[PDB]
Amino acid sequence: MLKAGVHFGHQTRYWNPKMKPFIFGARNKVHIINLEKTVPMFNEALAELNKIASRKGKILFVGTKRAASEAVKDAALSCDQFFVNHRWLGGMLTNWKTVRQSIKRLKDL
RNA sequence: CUGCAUGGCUGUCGUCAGCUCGUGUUGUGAAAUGUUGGGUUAAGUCCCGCAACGAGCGCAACCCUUAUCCUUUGUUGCCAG
């Protein structure tokens, strides 16, 4: 079975035409997805996440959005989970050459 | 003979707050960014914040000196005891 109950939103006024893979009709105050074929909307993405997670890969969780900032910090127990949730810096993944000296500052201070 | 040849030697914009670099980003590229912006300062000084994060020179700090008390040594100055 391809459900897997994961979505209950119905989007009552405004939509994006890029959502056409999931939305198969819209009549009267709804832009609702297909809820009986939900698994193919994420199965390949979670299979790739499972492949990375089982090949010692490091997983970064991002949630600066206040609703979930304290929720995204807990998901793993033995796998390499990392998170950012209160605040970012400019070039915090790209300028790691400079961030790796601020990681020292967190204990040197 | 000669400070548009050079040393030496002395001034001034100027103790002014000015001046840039790496990494990361951007633009075809020279080059920009940071250094703009907010509140400020003696001041690119300090805190706050974003595609920027950090570093250094000048600055800051540190130096010589002044008003005051405590303590001590004294003449052919001073005379308190």
How far apart are the C-alpha atoms of A47 and A103, rounded to whole Å? 33
Residue A6: how many other CB atoms lie within 10 Å: 11
Resolution in A: 17.0
The answer to whether the C-beta of A64 is closer than 7 A to strand B is no
For nucleotide B25, give the residue with the nearest CA to its C1'. A91
| Elucidation technique | cryo-EM
How far apart are the C-alpha atoms of A82 and A47, rounded to whole Å? 20
How far apart are the C-alpha atoms of A25 and A12, rounded to whole Å? 13
